Ligand binder design. Structure first.
Ligand SMILES: NC(=O)c1ccc[n+]([C@@H]2O[C@H](COP(=O)([O-])OP(=O)(O)OC[C@H]3O[C@@H](n4cnc5c(N)ncnc54)[C@H](O)[C@@H]3O)[C@@H](O)[C@H]2O)c1
Ligand SMILES: NC(=O)c1ccc[n+]([C@@H]2O[C@H](COP(=O)([O-])OP(=O)(O)OC[C@H]3O[C@@H](n4cnc5c(N)ncnc54)[C@H](O)[C@@H]3O)[C@@H](O)[C@H]2O)c1
Ligand SMILES: NC(=O)c1ccc[n+]([C@@H]2O[C@H](COP(=O)([O-])OP(=O)(O)OC[C@H]3O[C@@H](n4cnc5c(N)ncnc54)[C@H](O)[C@@H]3O)[C@@H](O)[C@H]2O)c1
Ligand SMILES: NC(=O)c1ccc[n+]([C@@H]2O[C@H](COP(=O)([O-])OP(=O)(O)OC[C@H]3O[C@@H](n4cnc5c(N)ncnc54)[C@H](O)[C@@H]3O)[C@@H](O)[C@H]2O)c1
Ligand SMILES: Nc1ncnc2[nH]cnc12
Ligand SMILES: Nc1ncnc2[nH]cnc12
Ligand SMILES: [K+]
Ligand SMILES: [K+]
Ligand SMILES: [K+]
Ligand SMILES: [K+]
Lengths: 461, 461, 464, 461
């Protein structure tokens, strides 16, 4: 008589289960942690509030936490990123999950609140796993008594870590966190290669546009922008890159891209005259990758070539000024998560108007909104780190420490390099790769143990 | 009446000068420092012992130091890396330089010592610029009193930083140092993209072999291994990668390479039975990139496919067991720095034997030995960092400090990120790239100053 | 849908509005085809034409259908594959009052029924006088079962390599009854569609069907003609380690020089029918096999037994007999993951453990995977192919073969390609769609290389 | 006492021989022909006049013809393409060769005449092997009596075939010819992949410029233009492509290139106003690939970005208007085949002037002029076809036929596809590739013999 969930359609559960079983064979690091720790039950007693895209890959993460002893209550961290068959399979396994593709904003907040509350009162949570910081924020602002009993947060993504570091800096962070994003097997695997796989995937599912021979502009060249730029260049696009960071821009140049600014001389003074109209008028596709605000702004959108595609693969939709478009232009739904925005005016449009832009996922994360986000074998790395991070903070038991000891432990840390390497090793074996073992002489020669770690903590890969 | 030099052919000086004038137009960061600091003369009083490949690019570096006030005495840090027209142009400008392509080991040592000694007595040096640590070693072992006058060392490359760190840990480093290698505009510019440009260059010059369609094995996948693998893959080689570091091996898999070991299951027995003979029997080209010892060992060389090319682009020739090949196999010079190594025995070869390997540059740095090393526009980043590091240590005046201040400053440091970004910006402008300026609101949104630095010190790019 | 219109059969007519929105987008991606619509509309060159059409009922085909109708033609349409229809495209066409019989996921019986519904109107042969085909099935049915109808048909315009082969066989046997245009061998078809279309759509279909990471995995592409070239690139550009098999040494040479290792599934290349002939070590490392040949049983039963566990198997050539799926149906249990995705469990026939690890993933039951698991080629590519189709239909319809006396019929009974000038004109509209600018020769330059300033720019022997 | 030759330095012969021995192992199709036909001596009595770039690869071709029974007299078909060690090795073998790197035009004509005349009288020639048609033209215009006794011409390259067809059309062609260029194992191997290998090779040897991140403009996208554009794109250049043929331009678009014209709207009306100065002012490198005349004209040269590199990889130097540059601008030799062209005037130049272009090889084919042209394993295909073509025309004995029979055979033909395939099979085997054999049922299914040919003559590959 299990009813403690809310999903689009429970009858999709068998299909979700078939895909979970396939995904297990694509996730050797995650499944190796199941096998290694299931006897020991290191998460026995853990009660995890989880807020992360409810995909098939997140289903394997959830069932790994459960197989190691945890109970969980789960929601998605984006209104479009759930795969409904995945949510259905998790609900059908007796796991509380509140998630469906195509939530409204009010439904989004309600789903998170249903994980926090059970039977109308605070659940006895003692761990948090978050992607972007929304659940973390709600707990600090609205449920501080609950954080008193929480041992830690394990945060997935660059934007979430930034929000954690602001709270730490301000003295408002109440529990320690592990920055899962900055493991190498996360940031330089998921953020880069995952977007390489899934950006052109989403754009093809959304539009079925030929990409070869067309012009793209990628805003940002951090890990996501590097992977995005490659997603498009490998399809034959002519890709230009914008950056505020000259080091990242130097990389874009050396990687064979032309580095351009939307603004003359790079000076974003807020005027229409600032816009490089000749450049924007030739762009067929713009992608935002920054985690920053209003990097595809109203004046750029006015100057874009007719029928250009606009999308965002950073965490939040305010990279693009969609608010301006809602206020001024008429939206025509092509199909779910694909809209034509008619720049002819706000009240109605001609069905044969040629002066429109195509917006994907209403500006939300496009790889998850129009496709299925990153593939299982990439998320394997991210999610093995999540499990290791959950084990570490749960075993530390911050909430039970005296106040003076808490003060020594209140920080945002990454996992040790040695664990990062062990995750990577299982990923390499998943491809059939064979890592060589140093001889004792060779290990002495470079100053490392034969077992690693093989690099100093400052190494950038 | 200038005679304080030793080069191959002083009449090459006009040709060297024409190439230096071209190189200046390719090195906007270096030339920007020349313009910015010429008036201040920040290196007036500096007496720099320099040991680094006497290329055209190093000539621009040397003449930037001199233009900022320095005196120098120069040698090359490798017996095959000098460009003789560069050495001549520098000597013809009245600068002491002792360097030619094709030195013997004894001549190499004599050259360093001609920089250290002036008129048979130790020069009154007070600064050191080094690439690989040979000059640094000699000063510490053979001229330790000269280090009483020296304010610091600025070290170019990964292997030399390793050696500095060992002395630091042993208490044997006598003067502070700047690790120039680990600026991002050095390690992730020079070490990776320089080798991408110059590895296939050197193999083409040495052999004129078609690379497309042939099998390569790159040993190592750090920065040099990454750029080398791309040098070969972009020519159409089928590239396999070996690694001892699982994180680097994970990157190779995601970059689209098969990861293999020369040894069965990765276990280096020392026995012939441990060699994967089927794999090595198909390899047309092996390239070592590790900075480690004997990573292309005698049993691997015996197993390689007939007529395979063997080369090393790490800093020292002991990556490849060339001593085994000298002792046991007969060497045929094709032309300078290209030898066929006949596996038929030691006592003479047949001109038409088919069982030989081709060794480039006798196993020394192949891009410098068989071509011209990295191009000017890439060395621009490395050498701008060198100049900044020289100004910083010279101004700190370590040797003039009380012993109390000395212990506090005796360290191996990197340049601050702000300077790294300023170097990157000049490189970007040299491609005609335009970096965007953050608005106040955007800078506040991501927590940075509009002028940078744009990333925390932990960021990996 | 016009009042009283029931002459169609599609999955769901309520998908029509969606299809129409996608048709309007596709028009903006198809400048060559829409340039013909604009150039020839007032002339109505297909007035009186009655075209039986058999080709994948996609959005791209919808723009083709509506261009023919806009030029005067009547049509009756079916798909040439049981999984290639886009149901919203079919609904939009049915809702414009155009007879179409097509949906995604037909049985073989339904497939044949659909073609027959184009041929028969109200239980009697329609008065067709033109044929547009993709693969030769409609052509074969007409020749075998309705020969009298070919008496009124002025020609066939055939889309694809496999269908051209079948026409040339009939021509060689004296059994082709009407002239045909080989649309496939326009350069703006073969070297555009067959190659770049599969580049776009092969990795697309594999992602949609499996969501597998492809970077760092091992692929084997069987064949390296135009489809094999595009397919290999689709996978290599994703980071796959791609090996190529070929029987043609010249195509194999191109694969070597393009940076691929060239291998055979069989020891020394010799396929003697024994298990001992299979290179088991090679096949046991392959994560993905793609067949591209137009040939039979190039991924045979002994290969399927030796493939690495959990490898993906698919076919992007025209017919499903590239892979021995009959063997898998006879011997192994099929698990449907979702439509057009099956796990084939090699442990036995009449059951499988839900957690079995010894299965293969077969996409689209061995049928054209780009069309079965994604949407086939993109509009801007099909633009080339379908502008040639329109030109070819105009040319045979104006030639009026069925009206000529016996004397001029023997003269005109041929299989021909479009002239190069027309190929260039299609290409020029494609280039302009990318915003490309073609340079004009000066008179002295045109004289120097011996062409007119207006072209054609190459001899007919030129290979591009 | 062999003196019937003229080369730069006969003492280079030993080095040239070493490189020939390496090249033989890189040329399996050609050495397969040696082994297959040596006992038959199918060219016994052939006396071949040869005019083609005197490289190591041509040396293997010459000695294959000689091995099959031919005598030859040889010259190069370009003033800068000879490798002097290859010329020396051939002369030292007793083979008449007249060729060196850096001929004047008068020397170039004298060298061809030295092949035509032996001891001041027409040699008893009976075969012609040509590259570009210069020897063919001289024989028709000045030595018609020799052509009465010549059985045929085997012509290497697009431009020479064009010249032959013009003669055939005008009725001035005196002997039949085989178009070697249009074997697939020539045109779609040599013309494309050869230039892919050797264009960036020459540019690096000439300038040592970084290419990644810079802007290139390739004029033409036939086989040479396709391979040249890949040569640059694979180095990270941003490549734009110009074309007059819309089908080739469509291919460039689909291959991921932006297709532009030097002229506004592509109309070359001869006025400076017609030049797209904005576009050309951004180009760092222009490469001509057309076989046409003046496709990099005076107004384009005036408009190119300062310090742009200019080169031609088509057969003749009139693709670039170098005449204009000699008449108006001052030339500064950097090193052989590398010139700065100072656009400040004809009247000398300032050594530090910034307004120059770098011209490679004085506008002659840059891959052979500034490097070594195509690699052995690629030229293997072209030269196995040359050998088969010589055998075919020599055995047909056209000169010995009655006039009515000559009239039936006077044509320009290609080799049969079966031989094209047999050449390709040897090439594939040299890479270790394994071609599959059709079963009888499969061969029946697709309508071919198990032995091939596998494609109809109309197939384009
Ligand atoms: N969709 C996905 O699957 C996915 C995956 C990982 C991360 N993310 C999100 O993507 C965003 C980027 O993450 P990251 O790891 O690449 O961060 P990052 O810090 O490595 O890169 C962001 C880059 O944007 C640049 N940038 C900032 N403002 C800019 C502006 N105005 N114009 C141009 N460039 C600008 C910065 O210089 C930086 O290099 C974050 O929101 C992160 O959470 C999404
Ligand atoms: N030739 C050049 O122009 C040039 C340029 C820069 C640096 N270098 C030299 O190249 C070397 C590498 O420098 P780097 O910056 O890439 O260092 P790095 O530490 O980034 O990379 C070296 C890599 O080798 C791997 N490795 C070590 N031992 C191995 C073994 N037995 N088998 C396989 N892989 C193994 C390590 O795991 C590491 O990833 C150093 O000697 C450095 O000084 C040469
Ligand atoms: N799915 C699509 O969108 C699409 C697009 C165009 C064409 N097609 C179809 O794809 C198929 C191939 O078309 P194409 O234009 O590339 O033809 P093609 O003749 O250019 O190429 C087929 C290749 O297969 C090779 N081959 C034959 N038997 C083989 C074997 N046993 N092993 C290995 N290689 C073998 C041939 O040597 C040839 O090079 C045809 O059925 C055509 O109708 C499909
Ligand atoms: N350097 C080498 O090693 C080498 C190798 C092979 C051939 N070649 C020579 O290279 C040249 C080209 O040979 P190919 O086989 O590529 O010929 P091709 O006919 O395949 O290509 C030449 C191209 O130039 C284009 N073109 C003509 N005039 C033009 C103009 N004004 N602007 C732009 N594009 C224009 C044509 O449309 C055509 O596509 C010939 O001279 C040939 O002999 C040189
Ligand atoms: N061209 C170059 N000059 C100096 N040091 C180098 N290290 C690598 N390439 C170099
Ligand atoms: N999208 C498509 N529509 C019709 N026929 C096709 N053949 C390949 N892709 C196609
Ligand atoms: K996914
Ligand atoms: K250099
Ligand atoms: K499509
Ligand atoms: K060569």
């Amino acid at each position: 008589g299990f009813t403690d969930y809310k999903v689009a359609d429970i009858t999709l559960a068998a299909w979700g289960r078939r895909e979970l079983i396939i995904a297990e064979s694509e996730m050797p690091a995650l499944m190796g942690l199941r096998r290694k720790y299931a006897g020991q039950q290191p998460l026995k007693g853990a009660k995890i509030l989880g807020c992360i895209h409810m995909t098939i890959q997140t289903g394997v993460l959830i069932e790994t936490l459960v197989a190691l002893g945890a109970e969980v209550r789960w929601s998605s961290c984006n209104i479009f990123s759930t795969q409904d068959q995945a949510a259905a399979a998790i609900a059908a396994a007796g796991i509380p999950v509140f998630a469906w593709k195509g939530e409204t904003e009010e439904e989004y907040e309600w789903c998170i609140e249903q994980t926090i509350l059970k039977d109308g009162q605070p659940w006895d949570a003692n761990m948090v796993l978050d992607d972007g910081g929304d659940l973390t924020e709600i707990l600090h602002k609205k449920y501080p008594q609950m954080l008193e009993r929480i041992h830690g947060i394990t945060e997935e993504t660059t934007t979430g870590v930034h929000r954690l570091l602001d709270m730490l800096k301000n003295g408002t962070l109440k529990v320690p966190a592990i920055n899962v994003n900055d493991s190498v097997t996360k940031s330089k695997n998921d953020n880069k290669y995952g977007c390489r796989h899934s950006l052109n995937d989403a754009i093809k599912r959304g539009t079925d546009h030929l990409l070869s021979g067309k012009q793209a502009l990628v805003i940002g060249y951090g890990d996501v922008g590097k992977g995005s730029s490659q997603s498009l260049r490998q399809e034959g696009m002519i890709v230009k890159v914008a950056e505020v960071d000259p080091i990242c821009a130097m990389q874009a140049c050396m990687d064979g891209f032309e580095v351009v600014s939307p603004y003359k001389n790079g000076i974003n003074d807020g005027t229409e005259a600032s816009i490089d109209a000749a450049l924007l008028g030739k762009i067929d596709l713009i992608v935002t990758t920054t985690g920053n605000v209003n990097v595809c702004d109203a004046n750029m959108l006015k100057a874009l070539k007719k029928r250009a595609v606009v999308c965002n693969i950073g965490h939040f939709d305010n990279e693009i000024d969609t608010a301006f478009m809602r206020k001024n232009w008429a939206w025509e739904e092509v199909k779910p998560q694909v809209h034509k925005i008619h720049r002819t005016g706000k009240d109605g449009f001609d069905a044969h108007n040629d002066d429109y832009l195509i917006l994907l996922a209403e500006g939300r994360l496009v790889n998850l909104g129009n496709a299925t986000g990153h593939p299982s074998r990439i998320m394997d790395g991210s999610f093995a780190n999540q499990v290791l991070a959950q084990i570490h903070l749960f075993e530390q038991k911050y909430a039970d420490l005296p106040a003076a000891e808490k003060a020594k432990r209140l920080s945002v840390e990454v996992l040790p390099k040695k664990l990062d390497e062990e995750v990577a090793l299982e990923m390499v074996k998943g491809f059939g790769g064979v890592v060589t073992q140093l001889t004792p002489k060779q290990a002495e020669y470079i100053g490392v143990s034969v077992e690693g770690p093989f690099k100093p903590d400052t190494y950038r890969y």
